[PDB]
UniProtKB/Swiss-Prot annotation:
Subcellular location: Peroxisome
Keywords from the UniProt entry: Acetylation, Acyltransferase, Peroxisome, Transferase
InterPro entries, per database record: Acyl_CoA_acyltransferase (IPR016181), Gcn5-rel_NAT (IPR045057), GNAT_YJDJ (IPR031165)
Domain N-acetyltransferase: 7-95
Function (record text): Possesses in vitro histone acetyltransferase activity with histones H3 and H4.
Family annotation (Pfam families): Acetyltransf_CG (PF14542)
Name of this chain's protein: Acetyltransferase At1g77540
Organism name: Arabidopsis thaliana (Mouse-ear cress)
Amino acid sequence: MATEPPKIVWNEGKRRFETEDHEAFIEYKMRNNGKVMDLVHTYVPSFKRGLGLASHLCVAAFEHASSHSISIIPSCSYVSDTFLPRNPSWKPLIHSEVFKSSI
């Protein structure tokens, strides 16, 4: 069901998700005492630049917060701007997209 070809590892020490390559990772921090997850820095090597993986890292933080009923703010908004209009499933977590569709 949720078997991703990539193996995105969670580093709770760095509060980050690292792909099967570990060179691509997504960071975040839980703001407001842990009510809002600030998704910080989506990165991916040359091998998987425009393969979606970078955005999947951002989505991994979505999957984490959504299931735990947490809110999110993506500084990864490169993902948010293009990807979130592509899959508007994470609006209930964040603003909506990069920044718009919000106050």
